Amino acid sequence: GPHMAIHILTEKEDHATLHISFNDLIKIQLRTNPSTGYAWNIEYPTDTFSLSQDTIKAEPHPSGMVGFPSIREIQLKPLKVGTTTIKLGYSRPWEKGKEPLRSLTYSVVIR
Ligand SMILES: [Cl-]
């Protein structure tokens, strides 16, 4: 085993189950388009993970348009061992009566 591992999750890993170690990190890396008012919202057990870093960054290419899309990166560090579900929804904050355009679900076992 390593000192620690960083596990990268993207849209493509929807419904994945990840087994990680106590001292590992999860990095969720998603594309996003802030110019539209949409953003990813994350739901996770706050007793089990700490938000180590949350970033939105403008992406270089394809230019294309040079600045679109953007990248959302959410890093989570285990606080406790256990089994968790992380859910993300891509939606508009103040929009009423609508479901997220896209939803992601990950199962994470911290052993
Ligand atoms: Cl976002």
Q: What's the CA-to-centroid distance between 2 and ligand 1, angstroms?
A: 31
How far is Cα 3 from Cα 10, in angstroms, rounded to an integer? 23
Q: What's the CA-to-centroid distance between 63 and ligand 1, angstroms?
A: 20
What's the fold here for domain 1-111? Immunoglobulin-like (2.60.40)
How far is Cα 109 from Cα 81, in angstroms, rounded to an integer? 8
Q: What's the CA-to-centroid distance between 21 and ligand 1, angstroms?
A: 27
How far is Cα 21 from Cα 32, in angstroms, rounded to an integer? 29
Q: Return the domain boundaries, the chain.
A: 1-111
User: Phi and psi at residue 70, in whole multiples of 5°?
Assistant: -110, 170
Q: What's the CA-to-centroid distance between 64 and ligand 1, angstroms?
A: 20
What resolution, expressed in A, was reported for this entry?
1.6
